[PDB]
Design a protein that fits this description.
Chain A: Keywords: Capsid protein, T=1 icosahedral capsid protein, Virion. Chain A: Its main location: virion. The structure is cut from a larger assembly and holds 3 copies of chain A. Helices cover 3% and strands 33% of the residues of chain A. Chain A has 2 helices and 33 strands. Chains in contact: A-B, A-C, B-C.
Chain lengths: 519, 104, 103
């Protein structure tokens, strides 16, 4: 039945809400260029040329493209995202279904500034998924090229490439090279279609909710503790003498009570204000940044371990690299003003999570004696301690869905730091390429590889369907909870809609944490 | 086995990120004034990209060279050693948590 | 109020569109949505079939009723037909109320 004049698929885009699950399917139109003139090319950056050692790399760029749907706005609409976040404590992806269909391959001819496009009915494309995870996995890096958030936008498939070991701009013996034609792939003409299914491994629900309590307040406010603490080490008066006095901490003093738990770990970061005059006058972006050091390279911790953006009544402050940052529609690449970016906020987790800018706490720096006054130092970075509890970073409508947990001997709490679901066997990479069609060869034999090809591109439709499991909200709270709401007041444009010129925009980040729970 | 990649390089080298970072806090010029400017980190700046993962834990230790003249002249073996303290006793951390012997 | 049959679930809307076919993309990746398309239109045939139920006229009236009639007298054009240039026209509104009943 595969043929020129019959479609190989239909347009399936919508969501369906059944009980404890939701199924969101979405269809897009794509265009695939020929990359690198059908060539593999090594790419590298050394220190020569004024570049920093931190930015050096070595790798390869491939003629292949790839499909990536790693952002939530691919699957969910803004209305569907509102149903999710207002009504549910949590969600996780159950399973996946992917399709390529209605494939056109077209050739381009140019002479005398005249440009002709025509169907090439016998050309093919090649598609394979990496099921065995045998290639460098580039999806969890939050790149561009995902399916658009708006279904009527036609998008371009991004080029595939990878990096490996280097010393400066040079390769090392361990650095590896991958030919993607060394994989079995399916070849498709206009009548052919492609499909596969995928099932997510078991993963904890993302927690969509805020706590209605904080660790330090878990106590009964009406009752004293039966335990004691050291209240006073000196007699009061003009000349005091040392003593040990003890008290039971009740509601009057909550800070001094005994507790079973500790706030989550921290790696401290620098505080930036949105009011400019409050910030230091200097360029502290890179220099005062919080960084980690790996094999002689320093790299920014972006965003880092999940920590509250700010404490009470300070919304102007945010950690320098410590929060996700989205651009408004039409924002440039480089040196864009604060007005075009959209900053997220993690403040919902300030119940269990230390604030990103502030210290974790203070510890004793010395041994005390009558000749030595006590000294207490500040803890800027704190690893895991027994008794810690913490919240993961929130997920956003336009943020990343999943990441691949690296394959390593050990890890700690392998939740991705940008957000989403850590996966040992994530959804596979889907690689696509236009098969090269050479122009006429010389008519006398030459061993050289053929460098002359017909210019071609391909278009088609891609459909992706995810089944999500929902965790219903059991709360017995009396008073009404905070919800995500559209503003009632009038405006020139509708939020999450096209404008006069026809372009779709997302006006703000939408997090998932609205409903509340008790610790 | 050894890894053919490093944590900081897991990205696609050909594509920019859709996220942003704080690139510049001051105007350039003779007398600069504070500002907040943001950039998308692409292949040009890899160190500034957002990442999902962190390197393993560390407990720092002292660097010794096999070329003798480069080492300090003193006996730093025990004194400059990395140690842990258990019930009033100090004991060397030998070898300790796994960390790379040296960089490139 | 204009006329006809009020329907809670009327015949559905039938929506049709030409699927966009983009021109050649840049060969280096760009995030911007593709604004360059091949100019296309589509043609075809549409067929619609309605079954109508009729209510027959039971009247016991003796004298002949008014009917809708074509004029017998000669004319340059036939009513409800094409003209010399080939265009079709409807010369008058035709209502449906001719036969009579008692209150």
């Amino acid at each position: 039945a595969d043929g020129v004049g019959s479609s190989s698929g239909n347009w399936h885009c919508d969501s369906t809400w059944l009980g404890d699950r939701v199924i969101t399917t979405s269809t897009r139109t794509w265009a695939l260029p020929t990359y690198n003139n059908h060539l593999y090319k090594q790419i590298s950056n050394g220190t020569s040329g004024g570049s920093t050692n931190d930015n050096t790399y070595f790798g390869y760029s491939t003629p292949w493209g790839y499909f990536d749907f790693n952002r939530f706005h691919c699957h969910f609409s803004p209305r569907d995202w509102q149903r999710l976040i207002n009504n549910n404590w949590g969600f996780r992806p159950k399973r996946l279904n992917f399709k390529l269909f209605n494939i056109q391959v077209k050739e381009v001819t140019q002479n005398e500034g005249t440009k002709t496009i025509a169907n090439n009915l016998t050309s093919t494309i090649q598609v394979f998924t990496d099921s065995e995870y045998q290639l460098p996995y580039v999806l969890g890096s939050a790149h561009q090229g995902c399916l658009p958030p708006f279904p009527a936008d036609v998008f371009m498939i991004p080029q595939y490439g990878y990096l490996t070991l280097n010393n400066g701009a040079q390769a090392v013996g361990r650095s590896s090279f991958y030919c993607l034609e060394y994989f079995p792939s399916q070849m498709l003409r206009t009548g052919n279609n492609f499909e596969f299914s995928y099932q997510f491994e078991d993963v904890p629900f993302h927690s969509s909710y805020a706590h209605s309590q904080s660790l330090d307040r878990l106590m009964n406010p009406l009752i004293d503790q039966y335990l004691y603490y050291l209240s006073r080490t000196q007699t009061g008066g003009t000349a005091g003498t040392q003593q040990l006095l003890f008290s039971q901490a009740g509601p009057n003093n909550m800070s001094a009570q005994a507790k079973n738990w500790l706030p989550g770990p921290c790696y401290r970061q620098q505080r930036v204000s949105t009011t400019l005059s409050q910030n230091n006058n200097s360029n502290f972006a890179w220099t005062g940044a919080t960084k980690y050091h790996l094999n002689g390279r320093d790299s920014l911790v972006n965003p880092g371990v999940a920590m509250a953006t700010h404490k009470d009544d300070e919304e102007r402050f945010f950690p320098s690299s410590g929060v996700l940052m989205f651009g408004k529609q039409g924002a440039g690449k480089d040196n864009v003003d604060y007005s075009a970016v959209m900053l997220t906020s993690e403040e919902e987790i300030k119940t269990t999570n230390p604030v990103a800018t502030e210290q974790y706490g203070v510890v004793a720096d010395n041994l005390q004696q009558n000749s030595a006054q006590p000294i207490v130092g500040a803890v800027n970075s704190q690893g895991a301690l027994p008794g810690m509890v913490w919240q993961n970073r929130d997920v956003y409508l336009q943020g990343p869905i999943w990441a691949k947990i690296p394959h390593t001997d050990g890890n700690f709490h392998p939740s991705p730091l940008m957000g989403g679901f850590g996966l040992k066997h994530p959804p596979p990479q889907i690689l696509i390429k236009n098969t090269p069609v050479p122009a006429d060869p010389p008519t006398t034999f030459s061993q050289a590889k053929l460098a002359s090809f017909i210019t071609q591109y391909s278009t088609g439709q891609v459909s992706v369907e995810i089944e999500w499991e929902l965790q219903k909200e059991n709360s017995k709270r009396w008073n009404p909870e905070i919800q995500y709401t559209s503003n009632y007041y009038k405006s020139t444009n509708v939020d999450f809609a096209v404008n006069v010129d026809g372009t779709y925009s997302e006006p703000r980040p939408i997090g998932t944490r609205y409903l509340t729970r008790n610790l």
